[PDB]
Amino acid sequence: LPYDASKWEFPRDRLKLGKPLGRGAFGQVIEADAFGIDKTATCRTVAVKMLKEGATHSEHRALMSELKILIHIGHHLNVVNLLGACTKPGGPLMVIVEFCKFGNLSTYLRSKRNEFVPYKDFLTLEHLICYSFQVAKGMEFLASRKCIHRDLAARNILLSEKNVVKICDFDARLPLKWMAPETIFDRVYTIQSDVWSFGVLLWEIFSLGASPYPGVKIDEEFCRRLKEGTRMRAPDYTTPEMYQTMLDCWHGEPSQRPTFSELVEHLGNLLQANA
């Protein structure tokens, strides 16, 4: 796949690496200041995806692959965007993306259970609904580019400066809890199964950062219930209409669940109705 170096290549000497933002079995992210990464004379903090010390050609083919997908996907305010890359000889392959200072959404929300009042420092129904709305914008975009997230959860939503929230990958979690029933069973992954996932994320937003299916067992009977119509109860901070939206996204038939386009319209209505 082509890599237009004129548009994307950024000089390693303009990149100053800082503290690691995360690790993994293959990749690793690390904070960094890049000068003029957006054509202006400013030092901008960014997130750098680079390989680990001793990474193989397939780990190398992987980072490079994800680089082209990012270039493919394109730009959207509600995704963690590609800013530039270091691919030429004389250094480590590095994929520079936007840095989101507040971290994933779940961890952030949990931290604000004390700083939250439905209506008026504090979060409010407007925040929770604005984050939901933004994630639907972000997903309507990815769906437009014909991408499927496969694991849409709040830990994969990062919070930046303005209350802008961005999707990435576009304490632990049990990823099965976000899986639509046909995905769990027939193992299919479609955007309509991302909407189910979206519904679980909404639930996380209004439970202020909680784990779905509170203390329930994920046995084969769990997936039976789930396939028959069993569903989570309203989280402590939802709006009845936000909960109704969860039930919609959790529809048995993927075709009957709303489309992200439909959800952007609906959440825009709820948001504006919020005032």
UniProtKB/Swiss-Prot annotation:
One of its GO terms (cellular component) is nucleus. The keyword NAD does not apply. Changing residue 29 to E: Strongly reduced autophosphorylation and kinase activity. One of its GO terms (molecular function) is integrin binding. Belongs to the protein kinase superfamily. Tyr protein kinase family. CSF-1/PDGF receptor subfamily. It is found in: Cell junction; Endoplasmic reticulum; Cell membrane. The gene is KDR. Residues 15-269 form the Protein kinase domain. It comes from Homo sapiens. It comes from the Eukaryota. N-glycosylated. Detected in cornea (at protein level). Widely expressed. The active site is at 151 (proton acceptor). Disulfide bonds join 147-168. Coiled coil: none annotated. ATP binds at residues 21-29, 49. Keywords: Angiogenesis, ATP-binding, Cell junction, Cell membrane, Cytoplasm, Cytoplasmic vesicle, Developmental protein, Differentiation, Disulfide bond, Endoplasmic reticulum, Endosome, Glycoprotein, Host-virus interaction, Immunoglobulin domain, Kinase, Membrane, Nucleotide-binding, Nucleus, Phosphoprotein, Receptor, Repeat, Secreted, Signal, Transferase, Transmembrane, Transmembrane helix, Tyrosine-protein kinase, Ubl conjugation. It is linked to Hemangioma, capillary infantile: A condition characterized by dull red, firm, dome-shaped hemangiomas, sharply demarcated from surrounding skin, usually presenting at birth or occurring within the first two or three months of life. They result from highly proliferative, localized growth of capillary endothelium and generally undergo regression and involution without scarring. Plays a major role in tumor angiogenesis. In case of HIV-1 infection, the interaction with extracellular viral Tat protein seems to enhance angiogenesis in Kaposi's sarcoma lesions. This is Vascular endothelial growth factor receptor 2. Tyrosine-protein kinase that acts as a cell-surface receptor for VEGFA, VEGFC and VEGFD. Plays an essential role in the regulation of angiogenesis, vascular development, vascular permeability, and embryonic hematopoiesis. Promotes proliferation, survival, migration and differentiation of endothelial cells. Promotes reorganization of the actin cytoskeleton. Isoforms lacking a transmembrane domain, such as isoform 2 and isoform 3, may function as decoy receptors for VEGFA, VEGFC and/or VEGFD. The keyword Acetylation does not apply. GO terms for biological process: angiogenesis; blood vessel endothelial cell differentiation; branching involved in blood vessel morphogenesis; calcium ion homeostasis; cell fate commitment; cell migration; cell migration involved in sprouting angiogenesis; cell surface receptor protein tyrosine kinase signaling pathway. Homodimer in the presence of bound dimeric VEGFA, VEGFC or VEGFD ligands; monomeric in the absence of bound ligands. Can also form heterodimers with FLT1/VEGFR1 and KDR/VEGFR2. Interacts (tyrosine phosphorylated) with LFYN, NCK1, PLCG1. Interacts (tyrosine-phosphorylated active form preferentially) with DAB2IP (via C2 domain and active form preferentially); the interaction occurs at the late phase of VEGFA response and inhibits KDR/VEGFR2 activity. Interacts with SHBSH2D2A/TSAD, GRB2, MYOF, CBL and PDCD6. (Microbial infection) Interacts with HIV-1 Tat.
